[PDB]
Amino acid sequence: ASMPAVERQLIECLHHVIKGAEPQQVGILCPQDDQRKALTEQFGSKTATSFCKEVDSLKNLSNLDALIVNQALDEEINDSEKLDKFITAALRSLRTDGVLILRQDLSKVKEMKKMAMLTDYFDVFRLEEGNGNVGFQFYAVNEVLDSVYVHQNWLDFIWTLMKKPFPKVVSFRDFLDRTQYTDTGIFAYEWIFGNNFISPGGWNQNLAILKRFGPMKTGQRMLDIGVGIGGGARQAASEFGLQVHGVDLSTNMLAVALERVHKEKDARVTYAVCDACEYEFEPNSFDYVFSRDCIQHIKDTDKLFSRIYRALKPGGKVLITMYGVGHGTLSESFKEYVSQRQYYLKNLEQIEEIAKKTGFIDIEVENMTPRFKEILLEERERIEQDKETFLAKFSQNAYDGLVSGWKSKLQYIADDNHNWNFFAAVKPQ
Template sequence: ELLDSAALDKFICGALRSLRVDGVLIVRQDLSKLNDPKKVAMLTDYFDVFRLEQGNENVGFHFYAVNEVQESVYVSAPKLAGLYLDPSQEAFSQANKWSCFNPVQDFLDRTQYTDTGIFAYEWIFGDNFISPGGYKQNLAILRRFGPMKTGQTMLDIGVGIGGGARQAARIAKKVGFVDIEVENMTPRFKEILLEERQRVEQNKEEFLEKFSQKEYDSLVNGWNSKLQFIADDNHNWNFFAAIKPQ
């Protein structure tokens, strides 16, 4: 049943242990009596994020597709949902043949945002911080708003390459905000990336006592990629502040 998580866990664990590398799991679910389509999405999400710990690794599926298909001619054609999944990394290189995708969150959960990955980030950025600049840089930005008072509200917009922030600035101006302040903080974040990369490289031996070479390479390669994006003018950090008049 869709809502029986214990049964689903047991089934998925058994499938992961039974399948060979490059093996494909096809799940056919009878939806003829299901009136809530949202539950179908819940099932696909469940397979997509499920992970089984084996040794020091997380094992899971690569989501291929979900399709609504006709049943065989022997029954009165109820609808079925099919999940095509593959536990191997190599097989995913053929993804285009299936018109499928590798969810970003799934990638992050399996690589950057594992417990070990988070601990490695915190070792660099400080407790509870997993992004460049960490506590000090975040505090420097918050101080620009002045003393925070009970009852005040702050809107925090998280952005990647700045498109969302630029859109927010346009919307802010349209709805009546005034004194809009825009500051390109990319030079400062470039300094932060260089400082953090240098600190890790200079303390490589200490880092490897706590984490693996894999985490080290991932961090350094990440910094190198971001620095190259900045050099290509394809990765920017911008600070926007505006006042809504009374």
């Protein structure tokens, strides 16, 4: 039971990709006439619009700059052969670089990983076109906000995808989902770190970090970059009354965050799947940007920092904790760990240099490695002590990997290879 706010959000999603352009040809697949007309009225005279009410009518659409598909796939999401026909027809109808905005409510789909599985399905599909393939490049998955605020529904999704040419090479997103942040990896991490957290020290430590923002007020807006399974965002909202928007590139991670907020219900918290280095955030809109033990994953720190600066309100504050590299002689074992994780580590000097260049003022940096060491020791006595309860849930292979990993990090700290760094700063004015 949606409202016109939904169609406006669908068009905003389109403009994340096409920016100031008005699309010349738009197709709309939407079986409900009122929603379809609401979408049509969003466009002006520079746009020609074609609409249909069933997917087989997509055969009549071509050369589209954008295809908006709204609540049309109830059958397809339960039937791969029908879904394949749709993806095929969608790809044929779009120009190369054309944008698909797909809205589908998954709240009546009991399977909680459905959003993630659909995203992977779209990302993998290939169609022969000419002497190569075409397929969809991933941009984002957003929640329909009307559904959160009016219907307590966090599982109403909008995919933003773009048609691209492909050869006949694993993505960053797929690397995260297939290696470090598999479902079993995620839940094994949560077990050691603490409920809802994938970061050192769990709830108590995250609260201590949040306090280093200084005074925060109810209703202020926070962007959480690399929100994981949501514990930090949920805590910022529940403890300080912040409105928190969390983003993560991993669908495995966000599937958990989304399942949990949909069940528990807190309208202060919303989530999006996207790459925080690419995604179009509203400029000058956030009071705070928080990133907890995420950015060691991100190579282009300069780009990230400029994007953070852009998204902050003047006077707003950024606070980040991250794995970093120390000043000791690097061991081959640490280097293999770094290479296998694909971490792009920096030291505090480097972070401060980048923050100054970006234009941040009031820069604070801290080497929190001694606290990191305490946390690793406490965490390890816990896995070692609760071995029997762990083995009831996960494999022996998973268990030994946690024990050996924590042992290893302790030695990496000892050589001053592995550091745990803090950075905060403010946008001028």
